[PDB]
């Protein structure tokens, strides 16, 4: 092979096979008895036992592995579980000391990028998703309503991107360092904000929030011409959200609340 | 053979689509670490979706509007007036 993305010993191969296919008794036996087993050994694609177990929705194997203090790729495991919508595995990973005993979930993408702890790295070089994608942003992207609610209860929020013409020091430093990365990070944040799951679970008035967000995304589509299609897609997402909310009205009172914004101005 | 050729084009487009920062884009578009050798090769080989991808387009715009930071954000009328005064 041209690229070596990872030689594993027989014991390590057995452990990785057991974790990948949910051989819970074997995994437990190796964790309890093997003193020469590297719990962080990786497969041909650089995925350790935790990543393999999470990817295959092996909750019991994940729980067994989480009892190892030196277990690695905890943050990437949470991101993978969130992306696949494995709620119980997300609960188990969120009980890890790396999340419960820290403010990791309440860190903005800029704040989480401020320190180079490589907590969410899925290997020795880079992360599974974009570094600016937080667990709450990823949950919004994948429309995982239960995961979004869980992260909201923990204090996670999606920070609103600054204006495209904002002159603050952070925006100028990001534009002068990597304009493409700045644009991609803004798109990812707006994709999280435009998500119906985040819109419905984070805003006290989701209809008004989605209407304003749709207008802002349309304006950004006009401005950022290269990524126009992405911004139009997000704007259509917001419009679809408000249309669905109106579609679910049953009596006149709900219709008046949606159309007027409070309890015949027709402001909305 | 056309199906296989489209498969190769889809592969390079997907690889470019997965770029996250400027360094990865430069590696894909230039072939090493602004010659744009791979962009020129894609044009020669008619890999349209590779050069039309927004990841390649933004770098092309950066080279296109070099030393004109601010003129890029202006409207079409401003650019037309610029052409007129240049003439």
């Amino acid at each position: 092979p041209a690229f070596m993305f990872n030689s594993l010993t027989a014991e390590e191969e057995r452990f990785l096979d057991a974790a990948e296919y949910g051989n819970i008794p074997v995994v437990r036996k190796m964790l309890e008895e093997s003193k020469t087993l590297n719990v962080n050994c990786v497969d041909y694609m650089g995925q350790n036992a935790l990543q393999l177990a999470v990817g295959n929705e092996h909750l019991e194997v994940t729980e067994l592995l989480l009892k190892k203090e030196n277990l690695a790729r905890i943050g990437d495991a949470l991101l993978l579980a969130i992306s696949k919508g494995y709620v119980r595995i997300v609960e188990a990973i969120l009980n890890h000391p790396g999340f419960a005993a820290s403010k990791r979930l309440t860190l903005s993408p800029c704040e989480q990028e401020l320190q180079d702890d490589d907590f969410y790295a899925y290997d020795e070089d880079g992360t599974r998703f974009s570094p600016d994608i937080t667990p709450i942003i990823l949950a919004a992207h994948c429309q995982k309503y239960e995961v979004v609610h869980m992260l909201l209860m923990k204090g996670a929020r999606i920070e609103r991107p600054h204006d495209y013409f904002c002159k603050c020091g952070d925006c100028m430093e990001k534009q002068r360092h990597d304009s493409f990365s700045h644009s991609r990070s803004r798109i990812n944040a707006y994709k999280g904000l435009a998500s119906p799951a985040y819109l419905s679970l984070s805003s006290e008035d989701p209809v008004l929030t989605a209407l304003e967000l749709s207008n802002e995304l349309a304006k950004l589509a006009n401005i950022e011409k290269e990524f126009k299609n992405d911004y139009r897609k997000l704007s259509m997402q917001c419009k679809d959200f408000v249309v669905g909310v109106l579609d679910l009205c049953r009596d006149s009172e709900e219709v008046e609340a949606i159309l007027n914004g409070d309890l015949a101005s027709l402001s909305r | 053979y056309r199906k296989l050729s489209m498969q190769c084009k889809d592969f390079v487009v997907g690889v470019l689509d997965l770029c996250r920062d400027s360094e990865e884009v430069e590696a894909i578009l230039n072939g090493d670490l602004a010659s744009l050798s791979r962009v020129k090769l894609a044009i020669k080989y008619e890999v349209k979706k590779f050069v039309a991808h927004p990841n390649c387009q933004q770098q092309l715009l950066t080279i296109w509007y070099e030393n004109l930071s601010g003129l890029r954000e202006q409207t079409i009328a401003i650019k037309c007036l610029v052409v007129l005064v240049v003439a």
């Binding site: - | 997907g14 690889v15 997965l18 590696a27 894909i28 090493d32 670490l33």
Partner: peptide, 29 residues
């Protein structure tokens, strides 16, 4: 040993392989 271009290409190809597997899992059953 490996150049910066080689490391970037390795990272991008690994990302492509994982992305391709994810999209394969998105195909209809």
């Amino acid at each position: 040993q490996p150049t910066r271009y080689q490391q970037i290409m390795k990272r991008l190809i690994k990302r492509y392989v994982l992305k391709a597997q994810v999209d394969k899992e998105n195909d209809e059953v």
